[PDB]
Design a protein around this motif. Sequence first.
Motif, PDB file in Angstrom:
ATOM      1  N   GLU F 136      84.794   2.296  19.291  1.00 47.46           N
ATOM      2  CA  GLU F 136      85.695   2.146  20.431  1.00 47.46           C
ATOM      3  C   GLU F 136      85.911   3.484  21.131  1.00 47.46           C
ATOM      4  O   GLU F 136      85.932   3.554  22.366  1.00 47.46           O
ATOM      5  N   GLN F 137      86.055   4.560  20.357  1.00 53.47           N
ATOM      6  CA  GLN F 137      86.226   5.886  20.948  1.00 53.47           C
ATOM      7  C   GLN F 137      84.973   6.331  21.690  1.00 53.47           C
ATOM      8  O   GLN F 137      85.058   6.860  22.802  1.00 53.47           O
ATOM      9  N   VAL F 138      83.802   6.134  21.086  1.00 50.89           N
ATOM     10  CA  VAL F 138      82.555   6.501  21.746  1.00 50.89           C
ATOM     11  C   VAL F 138      82.396   5.729  23.060  1.00 50.89           C
ATOM     12  O   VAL F 138      82.004   6.295  24.088  1.00 50.89           O
ATOM     13  N   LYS F 139      82.734   4.438  23.058  1.00 53.65           N
ATOM     14  CA  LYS F 139      82.619   3.642  24.278  1.00 53.65           C
ATOM     15  C   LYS F 139      83.585   4.127  25.354  1.00 53.65           C
ATOM     16  O   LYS F 139      83.216   4.228  26.529  1.00 53.65           O
ATOM     17  N   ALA F 140      84.824   4.429  24.965  1.00 50.60           N
ATOM     18  CA  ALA F 140      85.822   4.910  25.915  1.00 50.60           C
ATOM     19  C   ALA F 140      85.401   6.242  26.527  1.00 50.60           C
ATOM     20  O   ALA F 140      85.550   6.463  27.735  1.00 50.60           O
ATOM     21  N   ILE F 141      84.878   7.142  25.703  1.00 49.60           N
ATOM     22  CA  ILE F 141      84.475   8.454  26.185  1.00 49.60           C
ATOM     23  C   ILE F 141      83.293   8.329  27.133  1.00 49.60           C
ATOM     24  O   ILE F 141      83.229   9.009  28.163  1.00 49.60           O
ATOM     25  N   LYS F 142      82.335   7.461  26.811  1.00 50.90           N
ATOM     26  CA  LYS F 142      81.201   7.271  27.703  1.00 50.90           C
ATOM     27  C   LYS F 142      81.654   6.683  29.035  1.00 50.90           C
ATOM     28  O   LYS F 142      81.219   7.127  30.106  1.00 50.90           O
ATOM     29  N   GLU F 143      82.561   5.708  28.994  1.00 51.40           N
ATOM     30  CA  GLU F 143      83.045   5.112  30.236  1.00 51.40           C
ATOM     31  C   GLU F 143      83.838   6.117  31.068  1.00 51.40           C
ATOM     32  O   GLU F 143      83.710   6.145  32.297  1.00 51.40           O
ATOM     33  N   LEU F 144      84.673   6.944  30.426  1.00 53.97           N
ATOM     34  CA  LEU F 144      85.410   7.945  31.197  1.00 53.97           C
ATOM     35  C   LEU F 144      84.474   9.005  31.762  1.00 53.97           C
ATOM     36  O   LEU F 144      84.696   9.491  32.878  1.00 53.97           O
ATOM     37  N   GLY F 145      83.416   9.363  31.028  1.00 50.75           N
ATOM     38  CA  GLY F 145      82.430  10.278  31.585  1.00 50.75           C
ATOM     39  C   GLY F 145      81.746   9.709  32.817  1.00 50.75           C
ATOM     40  O   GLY F 145      81.610  10.390  33.838  1.00 50.75           O
ATOM     41  N   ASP F 146      81.289   8.453  32.729  1.00 54.63           N
ATOM     42  CA  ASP F 146      80.739   7.753  33.893  1.00 54.63           C
ATOM     43  C   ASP F 146      81.679   7.833  35.093  1.00 54.63           C
ATOM     44  O   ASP F 146      81.247   8.126  36.211  1.00 54.63           O
ATOM     45  N   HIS F 147      82.971   7.548  34.881  1.00 57.67           N
ATOM     46  CA  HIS F 147      83.920   7.534  35.994  1.00 57.67           C
ATOM     47  C   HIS F 147      84.053   8.919  36.612  1.00 57.67           C
ATOM     48  O   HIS F 147      84.040   9.069  37.839  1.00 57.67           O
ATOM     49  N   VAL F 148      84.235   9.941  35.769  1.00 55.02           N
ATOM     50  CA  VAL F 148      84.320  11.318  36.256  1.00 55.02           C
ATOM     51  C   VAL F 148      83.079  11.675  37.064  1.00 55.02           C
ATOM     52  O   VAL F 148      83.173  12.264  38.149  1.00 55.02           O
ATOM     53  N   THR F 149      81.899  11.299  36.565  1.00 55.34           N
ATOM     54  CA  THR F 149      80.651  11.616  37.262  1.00 55.34           C
ATOM     55  C   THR F 149      80.606  10.965  38.647  1.00 55.34           C
ATOM     56  O   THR F 149      80.307  11.623  39.651  1.00 55.34           O
ATOM     57  N   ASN F 150      80.904   9.666  38.723  1.00 56.70           N
ATOM     58  CA  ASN F 150      80.852   8.990  40.016  1.00 56.70           C
ATOM     59  C   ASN F 150      81.863   9.577  40.994  1.00 56.70           C
ATOM     60  O   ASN F 150      81.539   9.806  42.163  1.00 56.70           O
ATOM     61  N   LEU F 151      83.086   9.851  40.530  1.00 55.74           N
ATOM     62  CA  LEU F 151      84.101  10.404  41.426  1.00 55.74           C
ATOM     63  C   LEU F 151      83.683  11.768  41.966  1.00 55.74           C
ATOM     64  O   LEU F 151      83.839  12.042  43.162  1.00 55.74           O
ATOM     65  N   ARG F 152      83.150  12.637  41.105  1.00 56.48           N
ATOM     66  CA  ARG F 152      82.671  13.938  41.564  1.00 56.48           C
ATOM     67  C   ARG F 152      81.544  13.781  42.575  1.00 56.48           C
ATOM     68  O   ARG F 152      81.540  14.438  43.621  1.00 56.48           O
ATOM     69  N   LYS F 153      80.574  12.914  42.273  1.00 56.99           N
ATOM     70  CA  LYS F 153      79.436  12.728  43.160  1.00 56.99           C
ATOM     71  C   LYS F 153      79.861  12.139  44.492  1.00 56.99           C
ATOM     72  O   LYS F 153      79.247  12.432  45.523  1.00 56.99           O
ATOM     73  N   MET F 154      80.877  11.279  44.490  1.00 54.88           N
ATOM     74  CA  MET F 154      81.374  10.732  45.741  1.00 54.88           C
ATOM     75  C   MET F 154      82.105  11.759  46.607  1.00 54.88           C
ATOM     76  O   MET F 154      82.370  11.472  47.780  1.00 54.88           O
ATOM     77  N   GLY F 155      82.467  12.917  46.070  1.00 53.82           N
ATOM     78  CA  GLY F 155      83.216  13.898  46.831  1.00 53.82           C
ATOM     79  C   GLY F 155      84.690  13.981  46.511  1.00 53.82           C
ATOM     80  O   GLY F 155      85.425  14.668  47.230  1.00 53.82           O
ATOM     81  N   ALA F 156      85.150  13.299  45.468  1.00 58.79           N
ATOM     82  CA  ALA F 156      86.512  13.497  45.011  1.00 58.79           C
ATOM     83  C   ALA F 156      86.654  14.899  44.413  1.00 58.79           C
ATOM     84  O   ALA F 156      85.679  15.477  43.923  1.00 58.79           O
ATOM     85  N   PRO F 157      87.863  15.470  44.442  1.00 60.77           N
ATOM     86  CA  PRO F 157      89.102  14.895  44.986  1.00 60.77           C
ATOM     87  C   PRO F 157      89.376  15.207  46.460  1.00 60.77           C
ATOM     88  O   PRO F 157      90.318  14.634  47.000  1.00 60.77           O
ATOM     89  N   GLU F 158      88.611  16.072  47.143  1.00 53.89           N
ATOM     90  CA  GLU F 158      88.934  16.374  48.535  1.00 53.89           C
ATOM     91  C   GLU F 158      88.796  15.143  49.417  1.00 53.89           C
ATOM     92  O   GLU F 158      89.565  14.970  50.370  1.00 53.89           O
ATOM     93  N   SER F 159      87.816  14.290  49.136  1.00 54.42           N
ATOM     94  CA  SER F 159      87.618  13.076  49.921  1.00 54.42           C
ATOM     95  C   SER F 159      88.565  11.986  49.425  1.00 54.42           C
ATOM     96  O   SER F 159      88.349  11.383  48.364  1.00 54.42           O
ATOM     97  N   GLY F 160      89.629  11.728  50.186  1.00 55.62           N
ATOM     98  CA  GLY F 160      90.474  10.590  49.863  1.00 55.62           C
ATOM     99  C   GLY F 160      89.784   9.258  50.059  1.00 55.62           C
ATOM    100  O   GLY F 160      90.207   8.261  49.455  1.00 55.62           O
ATOM    101  N   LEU F 161      88.737   9.228  50.897  1.00 51.96           N
ATOM    102  CA  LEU F 161      87.904   8.037  51.045  1.00 51.96           C
ATOM    103  C   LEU F 161      87.177   7.702  49.747  1.00 51.96           C
ATOM    104  O   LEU F 161      87.034   6.527  49.391  1.00 51.96           O
TER     105      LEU F 161
END
Lengths: 172, 172, 172, 172, 172, 172
Positions: F136-161
Amino acid sequence: TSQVRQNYHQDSEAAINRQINLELYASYVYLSMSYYFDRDDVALKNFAKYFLHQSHEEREHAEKLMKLQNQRGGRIFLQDIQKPDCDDWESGLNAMECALHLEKNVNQSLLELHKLATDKNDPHLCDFIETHYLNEQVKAIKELGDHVTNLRKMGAPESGLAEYLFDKHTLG
Amino acid sequence: TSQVRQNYHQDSEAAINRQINLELYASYVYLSMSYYFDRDDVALKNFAKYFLHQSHEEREHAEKLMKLQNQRGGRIFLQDIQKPDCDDWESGLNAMECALHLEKNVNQSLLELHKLATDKNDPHLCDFIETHYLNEQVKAIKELGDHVTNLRKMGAPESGLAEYLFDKHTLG
Amino acid sequence: TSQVRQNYHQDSEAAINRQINLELYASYVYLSMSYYFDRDDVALKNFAKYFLHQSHEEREHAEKLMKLQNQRGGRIFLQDIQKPDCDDWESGLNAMECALHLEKNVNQSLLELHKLATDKNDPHLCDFIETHYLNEQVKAIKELGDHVTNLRKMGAPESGLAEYLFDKHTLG
Amino acid sequence: TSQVRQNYHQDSEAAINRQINLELYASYVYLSMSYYFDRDDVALKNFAKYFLHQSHEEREHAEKLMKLQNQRGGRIFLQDIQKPDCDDWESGLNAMECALHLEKNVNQSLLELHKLATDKNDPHLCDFIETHYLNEQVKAIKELGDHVTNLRKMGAPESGLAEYLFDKHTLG
Amino acid sequence: TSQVRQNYHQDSEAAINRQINLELYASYVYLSMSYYFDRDDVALKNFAKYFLHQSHEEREHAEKLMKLQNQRGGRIFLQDIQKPDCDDWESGLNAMECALHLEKNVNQSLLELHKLATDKNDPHLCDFIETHYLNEQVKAIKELGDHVTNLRKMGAPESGLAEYLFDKHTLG
Amino acid sequence: TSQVRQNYHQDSEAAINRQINLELYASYVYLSMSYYFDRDDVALKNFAKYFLHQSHEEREHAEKLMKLQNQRGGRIFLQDIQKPDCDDWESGLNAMECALHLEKNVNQSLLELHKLATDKNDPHLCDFIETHYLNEQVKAIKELGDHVTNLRKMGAPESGLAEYLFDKHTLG
Ligand SMILES: [Ca+2]
Ligand SMILES: [Ca+2]
Ligand SMILES: [Ca+2]
Ligand SMILES: [Ca+2]
Ligand SMILES: [Ca+2]
Ligand SMILES: [Ca+2]
Ligand SMILES: [Ca+2]
Ligand SMILES: [Ca+2]
Ligand SMILES: [Fe+3]
Ligand SMILES: [Fe+3]
Ligand SMILES: [Fe+3]
Ligand SMILES: [Fe+3]
Ligand SMILES: [Fe+3]
Ligand SMILES: [Fe+3]
Ligand SMILES: [Fe+3]
Ligand SMILES: [Fe+3]
Ligand SMILES: [Fe+3]
Ligand SMILES: [Fe+3]
Ligand SMILES: [Fe+3]
Ligand SMILES: [Fe+3]
Ligand SMILES: [Fe+3]
Ligand SMILES: [Fe+3]
Ligand SMILES: [Fe+3]
Ligand SMILES: [Fe+3]
Ligand SMILES: [Fe+3]
Ligand SMILES: [Fe+3]
């Protein structure tokens, strides 16, 4: 000028804006009549429902004119909605008589709108009026005439029994 | 002192006990009115049903006050239920007028109860009264006013036809 | 004086009549905003639906105050419904900001109404306001604040892409 | 004299009116017992339900006597409903014992009513009593005797465990 | 200052933040009690379920206060959640007595919150407390009083049979 | 010593008690993050739901450790739940980054717990950790890594869009 505007005369646009205000006013008149019959010292609950329904219909008529104004590329300009003529509408028969008078005045304005659209060779606006407004007005006026006739023949307004039974058997 | 009692003033407890007796009395009044209209020489069967229903509701109101008294840790003290003022209620319109008068007196007592709970800073008792009693009283009074108005306008009580048709078309 | 009137101060009756006009005005403002977004040169169809729904709700709020006025035995007195402040509402973000401002003004008037009912010891009117109006206003204001925040953060109003996507993903 | 009255002696009419008050009183006694067991320091919720049900039944018995009075052309005359003997009913066993005593007193009054109807040769009133009241009283008395017996044998009232388990397993 | 904030006093915001921590603490107390009854040397599985359910409810109460804080434009400030007073809760009756004490303390804090909102003329916050918290507290306190009463009357805590049967028949 | 205790070292019991507090703390952190995104000036409703769900899961993890402690015959000892590190979590990307950091710290503590159980030859505790916590911990960490990666690639946090669209399309 709007990218969609075509064959839409400035006089037509202004007359549609006047028609929008007249339908909102009629909606307001019917709203006032409705809650008169909701008074504890009047207490005709189907008279109140009948006029509330008429109030919502008139506001739907106004919104369809606002949609038409935007469909043709005119610009809606709204005006104050005048408070209705009376606060106290006297009796069920008197209210029905004032509604008949109001619907014939709305009908007159619609016919002048149709004349103007014909004079400006706007067949789309002519058909809009005919399809959605003219026969609805004729039907409303005939129904209000029927109601006035039955109430008078029953002995309204002196007979409170007549207005009670009309509320039950025709409007209920 | 009760293990559950909190922020419940002795004056509030006593006023709740007085309210319990007043609702039982009103239940008794409505019971008397109901079987008046069940008499063979009165014979308005929907007047009788209407007042019997009101009788059961008032007794439900009394039982909810008894539950509230125990919920707050007070002690119910019951008193005699006084026999109603009249044995003969005259007519449908007269009964409706006496019910209106009774409901306004019950409403007055409820408002004095709310004033006392506010003066004793008992917000739970204030909300209890508001949620379960105040709008129910306003609705009952408005409905009884409507009924009195229609019966008078129909020509009651001299017109036995009016009370017959009201029984059929409004209370049936 | 009305047979049903009880504990209903003349100042309360007048303030309810002022609240009725304010809700009708807010209904009219929302109606104007709705058909602005229906313009061919604005063309945000979910902004238009959102504000049309708000328009109908405000008119329902007005009708419930008219019902309350009659329930308590006051008399409805209607006034003109003033035309809204703007004909052109600029952008989706500007409209949302004007709606937020309008709802806070309606909320202020409701709080002054509650203060007056408390000052006149009218617990039924106090609970009416609390049950049907106060939390609805708080919810509306919070939702309009959320919308304003998201639109600003997305880059509205300079970014027409932001208003397009907000219309799709939040209001659609 | 009523157009429907036939073979209905004035003594019978008066005795029915006394029976009506006795059933209302018994309804009131059971209501008092019910909310005693609803107290936070008594807390036997099925004892409370059992006696509340008995309260509603007794009031139904009273209403059927009022209907009978009108069916025969007599006139209902209502009296005060006396507050019950105790405010505090001590224990589940004590309440059951007082209910047994009350039902036997109601039964005694019904038997004297039957004797009077027989003495006045009113077979319709005799059969009314027999069909709706006599076996119901015998059944109630037998059931209350059963309950008293089980509670005593279980060790009530000193054993609070006995009253707890009786509430669960017999009245639940 | 928040764009949504209106009529929300700084003292109210701070008191809501204190109420949030008190509900989280009560949630923690109930969690501790629950798993005490899950011990192999205590083994009352319905006592454990009862208190676990109370734990989840209190945490729902805390989350609704956090939602309210944001609805009004205040800012949530969280504090440590203090570990509960005891690790060992002695018996089912002792736990029920500590829960009663805890709920009355939570109720006291809610009443002081209502007093403050009244003093600051915040009718929305007054109604929030009344609608969601005051009657829930009164109901919880009455139910815990009932439980304490039955357990004492059954012979708890010396009688382990009483706590076993209460767990089966009241909490199961 | 508990009648059920077998092969359960005192060090294991103490480490389980420390793990219980760490999961409650993580539940509290996620609760704080959730209502940050519920603020009217943040207004990311799916970020708020995502973290509220994570909050409830962590509390379920804590309760399963409390059940395990009792299953093995240890004794739960609870500690204060520390208030989270921040009140203001800055942005969606910052919150996701703090959650990733928190989950890796929880994972580290679980691995040290597994090492201790292995050192004390407690295969039941080893399998408990592996079955319910490690993947469960490994799955949670992988999912949070995915989220961080997508948000950074999208231009967060400066891009509120970016945060608006991530909230819609990934968390909605
Ligand atoms: Ca004028
Ligand atoms: Ca007397
Ligand atoms: Ca103007
Ligand atoms: Ca309230
Ligand atoms: Ca006496
Ligand atoms: Ca027979
Ligand atoms: Ca401490
Ligand atoms: Ca700290
Ligand atoms: Fe029309
Ligand atoms: Fe004017
Ligand atoms: Fe029409
Ligand atoms: Fe009542
Ligand atoms: Fe008397
Ligand atoms: Fe009533
Ligand atoms: Fe409104
Ligand atoms: Fe003007
Ligand atoms: Fe609104
Ligand atoms: Fe009986
Ligand atoms: Fe007496
Ligand atoms: Fe019986
Ligand atoms: Fe709580
Ligand atoms: Fe501490
Ligand atoms: Fe609670
Ligand atoms: Fe976890
Ligand atoms: Fe700390
Ligand atoms: Fe996790």
